[PDB]
Structure formats: structure tokens, C-alpha cells
Amino acid sequence: ENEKIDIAIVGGGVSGVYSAWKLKTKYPNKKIVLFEGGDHIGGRLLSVIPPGIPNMVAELGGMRILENTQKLIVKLIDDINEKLSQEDQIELYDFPVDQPQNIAYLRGEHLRLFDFTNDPDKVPYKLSFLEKGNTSGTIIVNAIEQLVPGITNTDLTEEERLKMCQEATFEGAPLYTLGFWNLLYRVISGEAYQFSIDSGGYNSTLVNWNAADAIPWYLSDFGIKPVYKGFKNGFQQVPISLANFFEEDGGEIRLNAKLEGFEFKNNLFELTIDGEIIEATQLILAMPRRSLDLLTNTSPKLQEIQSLIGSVTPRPLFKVFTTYSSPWWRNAGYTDSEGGYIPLQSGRTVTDLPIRQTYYWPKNNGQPSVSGESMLLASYDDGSNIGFWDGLRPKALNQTWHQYKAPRKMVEELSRQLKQIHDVDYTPAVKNASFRDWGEDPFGGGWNSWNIGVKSWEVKEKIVHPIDNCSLYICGEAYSDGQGWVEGALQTADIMLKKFIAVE
Amino acid sequence: ENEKIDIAIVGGGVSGVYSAWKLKTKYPNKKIVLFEGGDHIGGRLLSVIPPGIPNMVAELGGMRILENTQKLIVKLIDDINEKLSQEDQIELYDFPVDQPQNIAYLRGEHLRLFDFTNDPDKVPYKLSFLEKGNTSGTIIVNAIEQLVPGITNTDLTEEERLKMCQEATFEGAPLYTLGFWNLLYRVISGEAYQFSIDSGGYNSTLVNWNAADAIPWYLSDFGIKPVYKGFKNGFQQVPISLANFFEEDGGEIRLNAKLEGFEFKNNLFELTIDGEIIEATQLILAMPRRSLDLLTNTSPKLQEIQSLIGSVTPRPLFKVFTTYSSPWWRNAGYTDSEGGYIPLQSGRTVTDLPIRQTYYWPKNNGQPSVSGESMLLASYDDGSNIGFWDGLRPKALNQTWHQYKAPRKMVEELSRQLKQIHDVDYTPAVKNASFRDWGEDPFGGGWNSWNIGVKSWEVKEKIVHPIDNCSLYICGEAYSDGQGWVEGALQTADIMLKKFIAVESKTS
Amino acid sequence: FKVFTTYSSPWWRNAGYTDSEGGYIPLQSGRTVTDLPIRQTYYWPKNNGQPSVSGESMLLASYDDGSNIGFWDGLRPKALNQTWHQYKAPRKMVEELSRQLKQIHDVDYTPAVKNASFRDWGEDPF
Ligand SMILES: Cc1cc2nc3c(=O)[nH]c(=O)nc-3n(C[C@H](O)[C@H](O)[C@H](O)COP(=O)(O)OP(=O)(O)OC[C@H]3O[C@@H](n4cnc5c(N)ncnc54)[C@H](O)[C@@H]3O)c2cc1C
Ligand SMILES: Cc1cc2nc3c(=O)[nH]c(=O)nc-3n(C[C@H](O)[C@H](O)[C@H](O)COP(=O)(O)OP(=O)(O)OC[C@H]3O[C@@H](n4cnc5c(N)ncnc54)[C@H](O)[C@@H]3O)c2cc1C
């Protein structure tokens, strides 16, 4: 006879373990089990210590927060830290991106980021009278101000801008019916759009997704002077700590426990897990769209809510890290007008090559690596660039570097491109390499974007509890206002928990 | 009791109707039914007459053949024409692409195609010492010669090149394990690659697909001086005529008959179509990968051959046509050094804008439209460009223009870009517009490409009859040597038919 | 100093150019020069004087004199009456020749060197 539990939570990412923790506190007498199909808690948070670099943490998934905007993740870090020992405290460090000396290897030209404003004739993009001599940030924020006048006023919050975008029209059409790429193309040159792709480092951010959602999202990060923090001991400590709390409080976690499908019979969820049936009175799916899509053929209730599930598009992201006996990139700085050497050593170098983005990985205190065993985020790339790298394939953390080891041919092509980007013919050998392709099942993407014609403000409220008189719940980054962020996952966990507590 | 037939053929594209025609001739006493889920025969061949232009045919799908290379489609046109009346004959016309006066609007600069070889300083790409002053064709063919020495020798056929690629290695690795984009990146600059994307008109052709398959495929079209023919009365006449022949010969066609799934029980195929079960002793799926993927959840036999089905990737293609009261583009030609005017009027203009490719649509005799109601293939685009157009959405032929009508906002953005491309502030209003997005189910793509690490020469022979002692057959463009072509669909139909005739009993 | 290298194909022929009428002019006979230590590279003729246009082919990779010889030297660790193998070139010398040949011909990839031989005529007793 079948195992019977009160609350089944499927998905061991941050929203799943956060939800488990909250629900066990709210309902201490309920039998709550969280099921993860993979071999570890964390989902798209994957923190690994590089071999030979005990004071670094490579972030194959999520790596930083906007501490000034993202109140939920900042508050959760405090909620975790008030329970952890002094030894275990989560500590943040300042996370650099655009230092002026960093390289932009664009259309075969070696630029420094300061060339974008200081030497427009050198920038090999035919930018217009208004665009010329500006960063991608400046060009896109100004484009957004032309499209939604008043939106870039710095006195407004993300929430006030999201509201303005919900009521805004463009040539008589509601913003939620229009595409971000379509609208940007009305106000910037094709060359400004390509410059913004290339030098901004991302293909997926400027795609034709929902303009009403894209505009406030863009303004709060990639626009107005984004300020970031990283995690001394890895972002993944957040979900690992919440899992630990849930288990201390009498919750149960099952790893290697894939939900294969579920039926709703006799006012119960019948979950098929490892060819066994488990009965639960409530089911919470803490998982993105692709994870819901994979369950749909064996889960009749998901077949009833296709238009809700289909309201976002998964956006693959790819990261690969490489390590070296020395930070050889530091030799690709320059000599200033007073004869002082300016080292290349922190933040991001960009390129239109498939590498797209290279980070000089900081020490766990935020300081640059100036000597000894050092690390690149060799490539952080999206869009059509992922196919290039894919074709070359043949307290405590809970995953090792070795479990994500990169294949040799992929590493050799990375080494070739890093050399062309930095304009050197010799670099010390790669010692270690790891990678993650977040386009892979069950994730479908690193982030998920609202589709054109969707009203996010309706879908996000509906999909947390999508069928009336049915104890089915959904949470995570995918159907949030904070897409591409842990903040988004916590936002929808909070909306879902509020509904769950009102109903059950 | 369930309806019982001998041969079920599912898919009313070229390979399906060709297979139906051949099999009914071979087995006149068998009950052969062809099922098409859509409302018409043709699949990715969709020919429509524009309103106001009775002497034109817009090709929303396939539009031309390489008459010198593609012996199967040339022979099929003869096989069709030897049965058609003089009135109905299929007639071909010469189909232009690169005229030297045509525009390349690249990185904000207005070029003519002759600038690529005549004025390299004007071409806004930082091409290397060896690349500079050349077309994309020249750069990529030379890259391919560096990668597989001897392959571009003009004495070789596509078949001899495919063989060389099967035995070739690159740095000790078999070619079939390597990616086309990865290898091109070893021999051309990033700027030459982007120049080849932009000016060559296509994103999907230069993706990281199987190098062993991509190289000979590239050489036979986009490389060595590609020469093309169009169809006076539409490519779609080919599958329509074969359907007609099949029915005259006693074959049956059911339209609006979507196969929902099939089971194999008691040595029969049980086909679920419109909530009815039909029994068939042989089942032929004349349909691409995505169509097989959509059947897989309700078809246990397809679940057994996932690695075969998964051996290609669908490649979306998008086309939208616009019409005007006059061919306004002809005013965007130039005055030669002797004061003669050179009109812009035939072949293709290219851009890095989302339009990507614009064709000055020929009359049904191949001649340019020089006055009166005229047509563009306004945009023929692929890769990330399709998302841009998609987000703006809110003898006889057998489909109308109006069934594919384009929405206003899509048309207004096309008009904006056409104006920027041609460097004009005014054009006469669009009268009519039609489009097709071939990324949509059940097609998944306009073409399908062999994946890296696949041995095409094994999969193409295996997948036509993928389970031993099981009368399941597959044909079409998707698992062919001629991907992106009617030729490929006929190639695998012929491989499939040969296997079918060797294996199967001729009885009822 | 002379050093010869062989390849499965005459890859240099791909470093010609397209003339003003669209005809390809192959790089395939005589000498390419440089101020790099290679100094002189010959596209080695067949025994009838005709260029090698396909199959196993050979460069006089470097024919160099003066201070250039020290650069190559520091990388060291009918019938005819001597064999190629008796003058075999060491790997590190060959890898540096390959690097320079690539920079000279403006290519990032060439098929691997199959065989290499050299002679330094500054040596005793000459
Ligand atoms: C490359 C990358 C960079 C990012 N950068 C940042 C950043 O810097 N800062 C930031 O804040 N955010 C970032 N993010 C986003 C952040 O990582 C995510 O938004 C968040 O981690 C997702 O949490 P979630 O609760 O939605 O679920 P997920 O993390 O998606 O977890 C869902 C879980 O459900 C499981 N599952 C699915 N189906 C089943 C099933 N049938 N049975 C059992 N288990 C199942 C999966 O195995 C998975 O573990 C990044 C993401 C990626 C990929
Ligand atoms: C934009 C575009 C441009 C092209 N250009 C050219 C060119 O110039 N020249 C050229 O030679 N080729 C060209 N091609 C390719 C050519 O059109 C195709 O390769 C060829 O027509 C495909 O034939 P097929 O037999 O594989 O089937 P398809 O045409 O793919 O037809 C398959 C059929 O199966 C049906 N089907 C699928 N699932 C089911 C089901 N469950 N039940 C019932 N029916 C089902 C579909 O409705 C469809 O009609 C082009 C393609 C496109 C899209």
C-alpha cells in the first residue's frame, strides 16, 4: 500500500528549499517531503572550488546580487545568517565588471572600454550622431527613455516602472503586446543594436521578448550603473543552508527522486517517483517551464494549463572556467601617460567572438588574483554562441569541479580565442577546466523571458495556483518579475506561500 | 470492426505523394491510402498567385532547383510532363540571385555587390590579407579547400566529395565528429565569418552542423557559381500532379487526417486518425524530424529509435512577400561611367538588418518586372532574425495568397527596413502581403541539418526502415544528402522504395 | 643553413589571390621572403621543374644565413649515398618553423609537418 504524505515539493532549487523551510515552520505537524531528480540541492546555483585555488569559488550558475534592488535575497541572507554559527556566516564581496583598461575585441580591433567614450573613431560601429561616443548602457537607457517617456527618472523603483509599462502605449498599442527588439529598432540604428549585443556581452537580453517586462528589468541591471555583490563561499550556500534548516526542523529531502508524472484521483495527488506511487494532499512544483513541459505528457492537470506554462521562453546560458599557474592576462594591461603600468586584472573583457565574455575571477574577498594559481570565467556566452562550444563536446558545498570537467577540444578552442582576444601567441597551459550548459534538460535555459502578448502581472498571480479547487502550486524564477535572478524565485515563492496559507 | 488497408502513407509532401504514386504502380491491387493532417497536398512546397499579378507565383516554400546537379527532380519533372497535356506542362525559367548592381546594406553602409571585389576599403569588414577583396563564396570555398585538401577540385561530383569527407581527418579526428562553424573558425577570421553570414544572406547554413555533410552540400550550391531554375506555375505543381496521378491510378488521399499515434499489435499497424483506428500492414512516414517527434509520445515504436530521429536539427526559415502598384526598387540603380542607367531589377539584395534577403520577384518567364503591379520577396530570413518578425504578429494550385495574409505591423516594419536598405524616404504603399514561418509545427524547420558526431551514410540507409522485421518506413528531406532540397526528399524516397520492394509481399 | 619540411598537401597554394578578372593565382613556385629568421622559403619543385599541385609536398622551409642561423641552432637539443633520416630535424626546431610559416602566409592552421631534415654548413670541417 502506497506511501502517504501531506505536502510534496518537487525541485531542490532555491524556491523549492525556501518553500519547504517556510512550510515546515508554518505547519510543523505536516509530513513534508522535497524531491530532487538530480544528485544534489541547488538547481541553477552551482558553486565549485577550483583545484589548486582553495580561496576561490567558481559560479557555474548564479554568481551575484544587486544588493540595492533585491530586498528579498538580502533579507533571506540575514534570515540564514541569524541561524548560522559565526564560522558559517554568508559573506558578500564587491563584484567588478567594467574596469576602463579591460579589453573589447570587436570586429578584429583591440579596444579598451575607455575607447567607447574617449575615441569614437576607433570604435568600428557606424553609430549615429546621438549614439556615437557612448557605451551600450547609455545608448539603450536613452532608447528606453524615447520609448516610454519618464521611465528612466532615477526617483522611480522597479515596481513603479513595471506599473508605468503596464499602462504605457506605443503608437496606440499596449507595451505588453510589443517586442523589446522591435521597439529598440524604432529608436536606435542597426549598428547601435549590434554594438549593444557585442560590447554588452549578451545575445539573450536584447531578444524580442515582452517590452513591458524587458524595459524595467533592463533599467534595474544592464542600464543604470549596475552595482553587484558575490558570495565568499558560493551562492549555492543559500539553498544548501535552507535544505539543512528544513531537515533539522524534521523535513525530509529525497535526492535522485525524479517525478515521472502525477494524476489527481480521490482528492489526492498520485506522484510516480522511481516507479512507486506516493500520495500527497498538496503538490508544489518549484521548477521552470522546461521542467513543467517534460512532465506534461504524464500529468493531465499540466495539459489543462498549456497557455500559462507557455507564457515564457527558456534562454540557454553557458559558462566554462579555466585555471592557470599564473594570471597571465595581467601582462595585457597598458602604460599610462605618466609611465605607470595599468594591469588587466578584474571584471569583464568582451568580444564578438563566441567566447563573448571573459571574467578575471576574483579571490573570495573580491580582490584581484595578482600571482599564483588563478582562474578565468573563460566564456560566459548565450544565443547562437552556445552551439559553437556544444559542437566541440564528444558549512560545505555538495558538488566538485571534477563532476563538470570540460573536454580537451573545447578547452583548446577557448585557449586559441583567449589568445586572439588578449593579442598574445603564448599563454601558460590550462591546468583545469569545468563547464555547464544550462540549455540542457531539465532547465531548458539559464533564465526564462516573458513572451510578447502575455500579461505578466496576471500570469504570475494565476500560475502559482493555476487550477481552482486543486492543491497544485508552482514557484521559481521562470514566472517572476525577477527573471534571470534568485530574487525572482523568492518573489514567486512568497506569492505561492501566501496563496497556499490562505487556501489550505 | 476497424477499416483495413494494405499501405498507409502519412505526409502529403513531395516524398509522400511520390512514394504513393510509385507504390500504386508497383502494387496496383493493394489498397494504398495517403493521409495528410493539413488541408492540402504540398508540405514545404507552397505556391500562391499574388492578387493583381496573374503572371507571377510567390514561393512561400521551395522555389528553385540546381538543374545541373539535381538529376532526380529533373527526371521527375520529365516523368510528370510525359503524362501531362501540352497545356499543363511544367516549365522552368532561369532564376537570378547576384546581379552586380544589387545592394548590400551592411553595417550602415550602402554597397553594390561589385564593391566586394572592386572596392575593399568600402567593405566595412576587417578581412585578412588573404580574404580582403573577395565574395563570401570565394572566402568559404578557399576555407573548405584548406580544411579538406583536393575537395574543391571541379572534376569531382557531390557524391565523390561526400566520400572524401567520410574518409577525411582534420588533426587526427574524423570529419563527421567535427562542426562546420568550428572548422571554418580555424581557417577564416571572425570578420570573414560575419561577412559570409551577412552578405551570403543566411544564418542557418554556416551553423555548427556536421562538417562531413556541410562541406559537400556547401560546395554544390552556395560555393561554385550556383545556377538555378524556377517554376512558371509554381514548384507545388510537382506534388499536386503526383497526387492527381495516384488518385487516377486508384489511390486514395485523405486531407484533414492527422495521425495522432500508432501501435504495432498482431503484425498490423493500428493508426489513430480522428478518434478512429485504421489497420495497415505497412506504414510509411513521409515527414521530417519534428513530425516524428510529435508522434513519439503516442507511438511506442518511435520511442525505440530516438537516436536515429534525433540525428538532425530542424532549421526554421521565414518568407514574406509584398506587392506594389509599381516596381519602385528600379529607381535605386545607378548611372555608369558612360551615362547609361543600370536598373535594380533582378536577383537578391542583402542586409545585416532582420530583412536579411530581398528578391525582385521575376515574371513566370524569368524576366524582370519593369512596370505595373510588382512583387518583392520582402524578407527571406533565418536564425535569430525570425524572432524579430514573429514578435510583430498579433493545372490548378490548391492554396490562396489570402490564407497566408501578413499582419499590418509586420508589413509596416518591413516597409521601414526596405526604405533604409534602398536609401529612399518614400515608397508606394504595400497593396498585399503574405508570409510563412516554417519553424511552426509540424515542420520544426524549413530544412534539417545532420548533427555533429552522426554518420549520415549509416543513418540515411538505416532510418528508411529503422526496425528489423517491422514494416515501418520513413522518407523525406530530413534524413537525406540533399537537406534543404526536394532532391533530398526524392533521394530518401528512392532508398525507402528499394528497401520496401525487397522486403514486402505483393498480396492484399 | 637549410631545413626542409613535408606535408600531405601543398597548403601554401591556398595563399594565392584572385586577379581583377576573378581568376585565382596560386602560390606554388619559387621563393617567399621575410625578415623573420626563416628568411627564405621555396615551394619545392617536382624533378621536372613543375609545381607540386596536390599530394605529399615539400618546402625548403628556411634557407637562412648570418645571425639567423643562431636562432635555429639554439632550438637543437644511379644511386644517392645519404638518406633524409641521417639529417632529421628536431621537433622544437620544426614547431618554430611551423609558427613562422603560418605568420608569413597569414594562416592560423596548416597540416602537420610529416618529415623534416636540416644541415648547418657553419659546422666543422666546412
Ligand atoms: C548561468 C546562470 C547565471 C545566473 N546568474 C545569476 C546571478 O548572477 N544572480 C542571480 O541572482 N541569479 C542568477 N541566475 C538565476 C538563478 O540561478 C535562478 O533564477 C535560480 O537559481 C532558480 O531557482 P528556482 O527555484 O526557479 O529553480 P531551479 O534552480 O531551476 O531548480 C529546479 C529544480 O527542479 C528539479 N526538477 C525538475 N523537474 C524535476 C522532476 N521531474 N523531478 C524532480 N526534480 C525535478 C531540477 O533538477 C532542479 O534542481 C543565473 C542562472 C544561470 C543558469
Ligand atoms: C522556405 C523554404 C525554402 C526552400 N527552398 C527550396 C528550394 O529552393 N528548392 C528545393 O528543392 N527545396 C527547397 N526547400 C525544401 C523543400 O520544400 C523540402 O525539402 C521538401 O518539400 C520536403 O518534402 P518532404 O517529402 O520531406 O515533406 P514535407 O514537405 O516536410 O511534408 C511533410 C508533410 O507531413 C505532414 N504531417 C506531419 N505530421 C503528420 C501527422 N501526424 N499526420 C498527418 N500528416 C502529418 C505535414 O502536414 C506535411 O504536409 C525549401 C523549404 C522551405 C521551407
Numbering used by the authors:
A (entry chain C): 4 to 397, 430 to 539
B (entry chain A): 4 to 397, 430 to 543
C (entry chain A): 321 to 397, 430 to 478
Quote from the publication.
In this study, we designed a novel L-amino acid oxidase, HTAncLAAO2, by ancestral sequence reconstruction, exhibiting high thermostability and long-term stability. L-amino acid deaminase (LAADs)16,17,19–23 and L-amino acid oxidases (LAAOs)15,24–27 are key biocatalysts efficiently converting L-AAs to keto acids. An advantage of LAAOs is that the enzyme only requires O2 molecules to regenerate oxidized FAD. HTAncLAAO2 demonstrated substrate selectivity almost identical to, and higher activity than, the HTAncLAAO27; these properties make the enzyme suitable for synthesizing D-AAs from L- or rac-AAs.
The overall structure of HTAncLAAO2, determined at a 2.2 Å resolution, indicating that the enzyme has typical folding of amine oxidase superfamily, such as L-Lysine α-oxidase and LAAO from Pseudoalteromonas species, in spite that they shared low sequence identity to each other. The unique point of HTAncLAAO2 is that the enzyme displays a distinctive octameric state. We performed gel-filtration and negative-stained EM analyses to investigate the oligomeric state in physiological conditions. Gel-filtration chromatography analysis suggested that the HTAncLAAO2 eluted as 544 kDa (denoted by the red star in Fig. 1B), indicating that the formation of complexes in solution by eight HTAncLAAO2 molecules, each with a molecular weight of 63 kDa. The results show that HTAncLAAO2 has an octameric, ninja-star-like structure. This distinctive oligomeric state may be origin for the high thermostability and long-term stability of HTAncLAAOs; other thermostable enzymes also had an oligomeric form to improve the stability. Alterations in the structure to better recognize other L-AAs could potentially enhance HTAncLAAO2’s activity towards substrates that currently show weak activity. The thermostability (red colored in Fig. 2C) and long-term stability (red colored in Fig. 2D) of HTAncLAAO2, measured using L-Met as a substrate, were similar to those of HTAncLAAO; a T1/2 of about 85 °C, and residual activity exceeding 95% following a 7-day incubation at 30 °C. We unexpectedly found a NOS bridge between residues K304 and C505 which are located remotely from the active site. In conclusion, the NOS bridge identified in HTAncLAAO2 had minimal influence on in vitro parameters such as enzyme activity and thermostability. Alternatively, we predicted L-Trp binding form of HTAncLAAO2 by superposing the L-Trp binding structure of AncLAAO-N4 based on FAD molecule. The HTAncLAAO2 structure suggested that the side chains of five hydrophobic residues (W220, Y383, W482, and W520 depicted in Fig. 4B, and L320 in Fig. S3) were located proximal to the indole group of L-Trp. Enzyme kinetic analysis suggested that Tte W220A mutation likely introduces a cavity in the active site, accommodating the long-chain L-AAs while compromising affinity for L-Phe, L-Leu, L-Met, and L-Ile.
